[PDB]
Every structure is written in C-alpha cells, then in structure tokens.
Amino acid sequence: DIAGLTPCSESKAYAKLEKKELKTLEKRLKQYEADSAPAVALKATMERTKARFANYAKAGLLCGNDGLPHLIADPGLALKYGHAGEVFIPTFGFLYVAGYIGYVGRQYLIAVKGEAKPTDKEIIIDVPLATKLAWQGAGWPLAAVQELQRGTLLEKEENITVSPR
Amino acid sequence: GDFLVHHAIALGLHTTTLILVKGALDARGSKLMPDKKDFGYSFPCDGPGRGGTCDISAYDAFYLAVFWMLNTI
Amino acid sequence: WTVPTLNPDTPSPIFGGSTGGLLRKAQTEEFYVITWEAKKEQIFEMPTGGAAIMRQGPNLLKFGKKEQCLALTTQLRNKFKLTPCFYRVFPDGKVQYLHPADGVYPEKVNAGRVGANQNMRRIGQNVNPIKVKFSGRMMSPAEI
Amino acid sequence: GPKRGSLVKILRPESYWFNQVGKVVSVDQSGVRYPVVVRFENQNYAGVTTNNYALDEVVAA
Amino acid sequence: QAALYTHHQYIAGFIMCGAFAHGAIFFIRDYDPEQNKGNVLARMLDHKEALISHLSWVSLFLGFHTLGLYVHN
Amino acid sequence: MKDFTTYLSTAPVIATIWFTFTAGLLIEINRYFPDPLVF
Amino acid sequence: KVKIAVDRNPVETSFEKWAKPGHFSRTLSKGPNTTTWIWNLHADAHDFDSHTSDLEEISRKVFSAHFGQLGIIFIWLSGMYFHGARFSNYEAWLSDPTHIKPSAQVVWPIVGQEILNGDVGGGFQGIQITSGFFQLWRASGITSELQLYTTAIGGLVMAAAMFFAGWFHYHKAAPKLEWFQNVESMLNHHLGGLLGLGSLAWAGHQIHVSLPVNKLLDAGVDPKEIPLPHDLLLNRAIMADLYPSFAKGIAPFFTLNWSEYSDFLTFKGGLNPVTGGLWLSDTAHHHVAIAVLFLVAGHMYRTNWGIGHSMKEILEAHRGPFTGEGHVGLYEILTTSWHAQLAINLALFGSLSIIVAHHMYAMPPYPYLATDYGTQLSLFTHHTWIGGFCIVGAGAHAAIFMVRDYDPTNNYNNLLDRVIRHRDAIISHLNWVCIFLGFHSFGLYIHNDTMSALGRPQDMFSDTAIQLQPVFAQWIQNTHFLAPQLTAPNALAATSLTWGGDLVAVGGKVAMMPISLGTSDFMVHHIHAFTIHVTVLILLKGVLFARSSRLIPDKANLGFRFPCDGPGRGGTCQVSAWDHVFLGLFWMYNSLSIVIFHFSWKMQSDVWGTVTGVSHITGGNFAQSANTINGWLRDFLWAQSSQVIQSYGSALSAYGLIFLGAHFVWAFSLMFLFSGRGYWQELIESIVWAHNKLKVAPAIQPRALSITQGRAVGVAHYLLGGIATTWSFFLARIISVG
Amino acid sequence: AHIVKIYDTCIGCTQCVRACPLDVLEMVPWDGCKASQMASAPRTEDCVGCKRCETACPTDFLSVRVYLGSESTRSMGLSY
Ligand SMILES: CC1=C(C/C=C(\C)CCC[C@H](C)CCC[C@H](C)CCCC(C)C)C(=O)c2ccccc2C1=O
C-alpha cells in the first residue's frame, strides 16, 4: 500500500501474534475452573481482545512487518487515502478544547483584575463568576477573531522592560 | 523509532540553545540587576538579599548549559 | 569627649578559658583588645563560646579578629545600655583606638565626619565597561 | 508638582516600577531633588510599595 | 566507525558551547551602543523577550509530547 | 456557616473537586467505550 | 503536693478563622502578594514556638496534635483489618499456609490494570502482601473473618473517640502548666500502669486464648473445628484436658508451688518444629516476667507521700571532680522545653526500631513466619529505614533547641558548658578517627579489585589469600551455643539457631541454620562502623556550632534556618544547622542502603534455599564475590536485576514500571540540587513579559523558590527516587525467586 | 579592601550604618535629603563583603553598593 505497508486486516504477523496471544491465553486459562470468577474474568478478557483486533482490522489500519499499526500525518495523504480518522480530527479537536480553556482563563483573569482585591479573588474563586464565564466560553474562536479584527487582544508598548530594551 | 529519537534530538538542541542564548543576551542588564554589566563576565553571586541571588552570571548560565549539551550528545 | 587610653592592667572577667584562645597571629602580624566597665557584677555569654562573669566595674578581654569585639560590643550595648570601646594592638604594640574615636557611635549623625566615598549621582549613570578597558589592572566603571 | 493622590507614570529606567503607573502620595514644596512620593500596589523584589522620584522621571498618567 | 563518529560528535558539541560563551563575553565587554545603535544588533536586544519566550515554548512542547508518547509506549 | 462555605471555596479544595470530576469522567468513558483509537 | 488542674472554654469552636488563612501568624494573616507566601504558609503552620511564646498554649496545642496522630493511626489500622476481612484469601491460607500466598489488595477490571491479579493460590487472585498480618493473626488465634470485621469496626470507633478527645481537651477543658509539669507522677503512671498492665493482660490473653487454639492448629485439627474463645474460657474441663494444671484453678499458685504450673509456663528455648516459630508457652512466661518487672518499677518516685525519690535531688547528687557543677539545672531544662525531650526520645526510638528489626529476623516468633523470605526481607529493611530517619530527626531538633531555648546564665560551670568549651578538641578527634577508618576499610576493597584485575589473586583479601577473621564474633557465637550446659542449666537450648546447632526446616524450606562469618563480613562490618561515625560527625558539628562559630560569631540570632551570610569573607553558602541536618540526612541514606544490601545478600546466598542437603538460592557465591567491587556489581546486582527487568506481561510489570519511575525522579532531583534561584527568577521575568503582553499576567507575583526551599525540594526528590528504586527491585526479585 | 560606593539617593536612614558588622560606615551631615544625612564609608579596610548593608538601604535603586576586591591578613577576616 502506502510507502510499503499493508492493511492490518491482511498482515500475517498480525495473525501469528494473535495466535500467540491466544496460545498464551488458553494455556493460562486451562488452570482454573469454568465457573470461577477468575475464569469468567479471563473469558471477558479474551473476548475484549478479540473485539479490539476486530475493530483495528475493520478500521483499515496499516501495519508493516512488525504487525503493529502505524499512523500517517499529512492532510493530503490521509485524505486522498481515507486516513483522516487518525491525526487530523484529533488535532483539531484538541486545538478547539485547549483554546476554550485558555480563553475562559484569560477572561476570568481580566474580569477579576478590575476589582478591589485581586490577590483575594486569585486565592479564592467567585463561583457565580466562574460559572458565567464558563458557559460563555463557548464561542471563544469567534470572540477571539473579532477581538483581533478590532486589534484589542494585543497591547501597545507599555510593558515593564529591562534597561537596554 | 527513528522518528521519536529525531524529535528527542530536536528538543535537546532547542533547549540547550535556549539556555545559552538567554545567558548570552541577559549579560548586559537584567530587570533584577540592571547594572550587571558593571561586574564583568564572572562573579559568584550577589548576596542572599532581594530574595537570594544564586548563580546569576552569564558565566553560570554557560555552566548550566553544559549539562544539556552533554545530555543531547 | 576625649580618646580613652588602654590601661593594660584591667581585671579580666571570670572565665575558665576556652578553645578560642591565643594564636601566634599576635606574634606574627596583628591582634586586637577591647575594654569597658560594668555597672554591677553579672554573668554573660562569651562570644567564642563558654560562660563568663563580668566584674562589677572595668573589664578587659582579648579577641583575635574584629567582628568578635563588634559582637560583644553590640551585646553589652543592647542588653544593659553598656558602652565599650576597643583597640587594634599592632605587632609592635602600636595602640589604635578602634572604638569610640568620633566620641559618639555612628548610629547618630555627628558634625565632623566628612562625607566619604560618596557619589552625588545615581548608579544608572555609570559608563559602559567597553570604555574602562586597557588598564594595568582591571577597573570597574562604577569607580568612575 | 501635581496635587496629592494624583496618578503618574514612572519612567526611570532602573526603577522596578519602570514604564508603570503609581499614585503620588505627595510632593515636597521645598527644593529636595526627589520631592515626588509614589505609592504602588505591587511590591518589588524586596517588599516595598512606595518609591521616591524627581520631577522629570514621572508623567501624570 | 563508532569511535570516529562519536568522538567527532563530542568535539563539535563542546566547540559550539564555547562559541556561545565567547559571544556572551563579547557583549559584556567589547560592546558599544553608539555605533551599533539602530541597526540589527540593537534590534536584537530590542526583541530579546519575544525571542526567549518562543524558544521556551517550543522546547516545552517538544518535551511534553515526546516524553508522554514514549511512556505511553 | 458562611465562613465554612468560603473555606470550601478556598483554592486547594476546589482544585481537588475539579480534578476528581475530570478523572471520574474519563474513567467512566473508557469503561463504556473501551480502547478507542480512531474517528 | 500534686493534684488535677484545668481551665474551661479556652477557645471556642467556629469557622471564623477557618475563613482567615494564616491567622496563626499576625505576619502572614495580612495577605498574599507573591508566590513564596504559599510556601511559607505551608512551611510554618506547626512551628508553635514561632507562633507565640506561651508554654501553656504550645502545650495544649501539642496535646491535641497527639490526639490527631492517634486517631489517624486507628483509622489506618481499622482499614487494614477490614481489607483483610473482606478481600483476602486468609481462610484459605489458614487451611493451608504452606502453598497459599497471602493476598488482600485487588485491582479493578479496567483499561488493563487487571493483569496484576496474580494467582496466589487458594483459587484466589490479586496481589501478594508482605506485611505478615496472616501469620500474626494465626499466632493470635483469629479464625472467622467475622472477627476481623468486628475488629475493624472497633478500630474505627476508637479513631472517632480519639478525635473527639482532642477537640475536647483543646476547646473545652484545657489543663494547666504545672499539671503538665508533674513529671514524677507521669513516670510512675506510665511505667506502672501502661507497660505493667499491658504485659499482664497480654500474658492473660496468650494463656487463655492463643495458647490452646494454636496448640490445636499445630496438632493439625481442622481450623473451623477448633472451639470458640468464650467456650475455652467457660469450660475449665477443656483446658484441664489440654494442660492438667488447669483443673486445680489458682490455689496452687496461691500456695507458692509455682513448679506445678510449668506445663504451659515453659523454658524450652529454640523453636517450634512444626511452624518455625518460638514456643508460645515461652513467650507467655516472658511476658509475665516483663509484666511484674515493670509494675514493680512503677513504684519509684514520690508523688504525694514522702516515700519515693526526687528526680532533681538525685540529679544533683551525682557530681564529679573532673566535671565541676555536674548535673545541676538539667531538671530545669527538661521541665521547660519540648525540644530537649523530642531529641532524646527520637534518638532512643530510632535505635530501638533498629534493634527490633535485628531481634525479629534473629528469632522468628510467628508460625510459618520463616517461610516467606520476602516478608522477612521486607519487614527488616522497612524498620531499618524508619530507625535511621527517627535518629536523624533527633539530631535536628536537638540543634534546634540549642539555638532557640538554651540559656547561658542558668548553666555557668556545667557539663554542657565545658563540652561547649572543648568542642574543638572533640571535633578534631572525631575527624581523624573517621578519616582513618575510611582509609583503611575502603582502600582494602580497592586493593582487592586491583589485585584481581591485575592478574594476581594470590594477593587479595578473602578466606583464601591473606585472611581476616572475626575472631571475637566467632568466639561469642561459640559461647552462646555452649551456654545452657553451665551458664543457664535450666535452659534446654540456645535462644537462636544462629549460635550454632542443627537445622530446622519446614515445607521443604529452611527456617534457620548456624550462620558463618567470613573475612567478607569483617570488612562489611567495618565499612558500617566508618559510615556511622561519619554521620555522627556531621550531626555533632551541626549541634556544637549552633550558637556561634569561629567564623560567624553571631550565628545564634540569625535563627536555625537561613541560606548563608552572603559571599562575605569568601562565600558563606551552607552554614546553618539546618544545612547540617540536610547533609546528615544524605549520608544516613547512604549508610542504610549499604547495610540492607549486606543483609539481603548474606541471607539469599548462605541461609536461604530449599532442603533436598540445602540448596542456597545463589549457592553461596557471597563469601567470594563480596570482597571485590566488580564482583559485587556483576555477581550480585547486575545478576539479581534479572526478574525485575523481565517482569513484563505478568503481575510483576508494576515493579519494573516503578523501577523506571524511581530512576526518573531520582535523576530529576538533581536539577534542583544544582541550580540557582537567580537564573530562575530571570527566566520567570521573561515569561512574565510574555504573559503580560497578552494582558494575562497573574495578580499573584511569581517568585522563584527560596534558597532553602530549593535545597529541601532537591533532597526530598533525590531520597524518594533512590529508596523507591531499591524497594521495587527488592520486592520483584525476592517474590520471583521465593 | 572590598569597594564601597554611596549614591545621591542616600536617604540617610542609617540602615546601612544600622547593619554593618564592621564599622565600615558612619553618618555625616548632608543636605540633599530631608534627614540632612548621607551615609559615609570611611573604613573600607574592614569590610568583608557580608553585604548586610546592601541588604538594608531601602532606596528603589539601592543607594550605596559593595564590590569585591583582593585580600590580606587584615582583609579577609580569618582568625589565623
Ligand atoms: C527548577 C527550579 C526552580 C523553578 C521551580 C519553581 C519556581 C517551582 C514551580 C512549582 C509549580 C510547577 C508551579 C506552581 C504550581 C501551583 C500549584 C500553581 C497552580 C498550577 C496549576 C497548573 C495547577 C527554582 O525556583 C529553584 C530555586 C532554588 C533552587 C533550585 C531551583 C530549581 O531548580
């Protein structure tokens, strides 16, 4: 396939490693009863293992001679070959949630900064304020891009500054 | 494997260069010690006052960068 | 006030002797001696360690370095309003009033001390080290 | 100088409060070199919240 | 092969660390503001803060993610 | 009592609570959706 | 004239200052403005001597703090017992101990951590414990998990009672200073009541419960078959059957014909061949002896009748010509400062826990105890670490008192004063004796390794080439072996199979054997003694240079803890007694590590194994691979690291993971132990520029850690890493190979 | 002797003099401050650099600093 790989649903190392995991699982399980809670635990274990292998094979994952899967990171490659469900969507989801957290943090800091006891509001939190700012943190990308278009998020040259510059 | 060790190498490079360049540039004047340039390159410390001054020389910055260099290599 | 005169014959306090005692420094390059007088008789704390009793009235002691005299000075000054003064004793016994001198301790201002080692200027107004270069010894711009 | 309680902007390069703003406590009407007295609300690296300055070093902002 | 390679590597690492140290000393002693004023040299010290901050950030992210991935493995 | 409520709203307690919440959520998620890797 | 004194309602019960952080210090209570505020707040929460200066206040405080500590202990104990009741294979192990392994901690079937549920036998899965509660409980006589259950319930109730008592005796009816000062009453009360009646009731419980049921268990009757304790109590007939003395009640004891009670008050010595434990009748007799001894001791001092002694009078009565005023004033110093007491007590406590570890591995008292070599090793090394820490703390608080609350006036010509005088001679002497021992002992090892790697083992130091023999130790062992014939004619055996003698084994496993001593052991003992003297030197300097110094003559006023005195007079970093304790802790760690290594290798190599003769786990490589450093490294360490570095895919994967984590954090400590806060603050400042540019600078100012804070965090992390590494390694290795 | 240097911002609060353990300082009459006193360091040869003074002086940009120099019997303060 790509770069010299093959779908995990086809790699032989995949299957032989699976047989080895199961030779281990059987030749460990055969020491207990069938009704023992240990036994039922081992059974559920093997079952979950099978389900995992099924899902990985059905996902069309690539895995070379190692048999262990692999991931590809280029938008064009992953898209032209249907591999967006591995890196692209995850990175975008993380970026969204992280921007959310950062933005609500910035807003809390700013809101509590213009009050009569910044140290106190920083050591002890206003619950109503926290909740309001949390629920309003949603549209943070739009709010931020608007602030940029107004040129407000960046400050002019008035920062504390070392002697040379 | 090659991928991951490559990224570790890049990290080592970046952090060692960071330490070295900060030491190089803050040698003239720091916000804490605006007159550091009046002491030359090397001097042990500056007394425990002001909340302690352990190893503030650009010399000592290099002295700390060497560890990261060894780690990377 | 006048400069006092070290009377070498002063009753030394009640002390059993400790390790911080005599060295050959006195016979090599320099050494020191302090003096004072007590109001009553009393026990106190030897700076170099050990317990000693001040004698009611004048007392005399021996210290190698100077900060020890400083410290016992501070102690007597603080704890009983006492007022000592001391003397650098040179190799060839050239007595030198190390204490008193100005007649009044420098805690309170006194007309007569000439303002010394002073720069009627700020410290950000010093010059770059590039310019102080090329001297027979290494000078910091701070001096100029 | 400006009346007491006024707000000025410190500009002495060395000053820990450089390029910042503080409240003027008062100014000496006499001729001392630094009659300006400026409170602050963020202590420096030694725990002080009020510093003295000459006239020029500040800007009432 | 191994001896040659690693030896030359360590040599180069030491050399670069010393190069940075000496650049710092150049700043502390031979520098002048008047001549270098206004040009790229001055502009460096002008944006030193952003420089150091971005270096810190890149090093920090590399560290985080590379180590986390390794330990998940 | 209000003193007690403010003692609650002190910082370390709230940190513990928020982290407990996040961790419990992640655990229940990995329970009900075991071993996800894609999508 | 002594009585009870108390004061009412001293402090209310309210959350007011609960909403006021740092209320205890008028300094901190004015608010935070920089980061280090938080560090300080946590740091001096319990520094009662710096809080205020009322003896009675600090006293009530430490009393209720004691109660809190107690309640916590009861909680954790009840937790152990309840876990043992509900999630253990304890009854299976009771059925068969020799093949079922204790397991009480179980994991949850989640993302993959279920693989740890090791098959310990008994049709059970989980994790093997090492604490030995199983053997302890069998020794006591617990059969039904119902007993563990009710025990846990009672423990929880006791914890609640302790917390309530603390609250009460602090907030409602607080005592007074003289009632805290009635020391003769306190010693009489403790020594008589507590220990005497403890040993007495102990003897009682042993006799009437734990002796019979354990006789039965060792007889092999079915466990649940054995009758119940209250039945044993009620029916004198059963106990008469067991020991024909019981038929006669107590009249024979009353008639002073004590010999007849010898049926179950024995003096066997040696061990119990079926369990490897000591003879329970022997321990009962022991505890009776201790009981009467201490109860008689509890009748010494005078309290409200002229009979009895006066501690201060006795103290002063002992004065010497070479010493001047002798012991005068000590009764004062002790009746006045907590810190002197704390120093003395911690020192004794640490030494005692060490002795506990040694005695316990020497003469195993529990049934089936000698079997689990893992449990033996674990208990030993744990108690040893704890002893080392307690002793270092003793030193610390000693120096702290000396700085803070000493008074020169009260002690003019004191033993204390003259010691302070000739401190210089003392420290110099200790220095030299240390460096001498270091030289000889360690240079021996280096000389050995050089004679080996050079190719001339003819000239090494072993049992083969030029020899060194612990003649004294072999002599003492000989004599304690031959003692009972003449020294204790009514002793039926040596008190330890280590004095010499036969071999007792159980379940194909050795329980004890006479222990050899070689040139190896000589050299190891001497390394021990050297490092011990070095640690003692560090701490003794730390205390004798507390008030002042020939360098700093005003060390006293500067407090017990401070970074330096600036670069003055050549640089004054690390001059405080706090830093003394710092470095002393370092070297303590080193010494304890080495001693437990010695113990582990000796056991594994020359005592442990299984009977066929015996098959030592390393077959005895010790006495030839333990006198060279390369041999040490390879043959012991690099060897035994196997199971710990291949423990994957098994319930031992956790041990390897922790091995790695411990290496990591141990190395991580070094950044702290080496860096300098000025650089940190500069970088912080650049970061503040970054943040602030976005208008997100924090209202709490960022400040790098204080100098002493950096030092303390560094030492804590380093110690954690080292001890965690060795712990993980020990556990994995011994559980694998035993 | 280690170098010392006062500055016009010497407010004369004497905390320098109030700190030095070596009598390297003293207060003189002055004019530039309301206290009419400027610290004075006339006895450099006994300063050991302990920097207690630099720890004291509350001027925003310090007022009177210390600088390290060569050594001698007199200077380093070593009892032997
Ligand atoms: C690394 C290092 C620092 C820098 C490290 C610091 C300042 C500690 C940082 C502590 C944490 C990481 C930041 C504060 C954490 C608080 C809980 C605030 C909330 C943070 C949220 C993310 C929860 C020093 O200050 C220092 C001082 C003296 C000797 C050595 C060193 C040293 O080695």
Ligand code: SF4
């Ligand atoms: S900060 Fe460190 S180096 Fe500087 S004086 Fe203090 S202890 Fe010495």
Ligand code: SF4
């Ligand atoms: S320099 Fe500072 S401490 Fe010294 S007199 Fe002036 S104001 Fe006072």
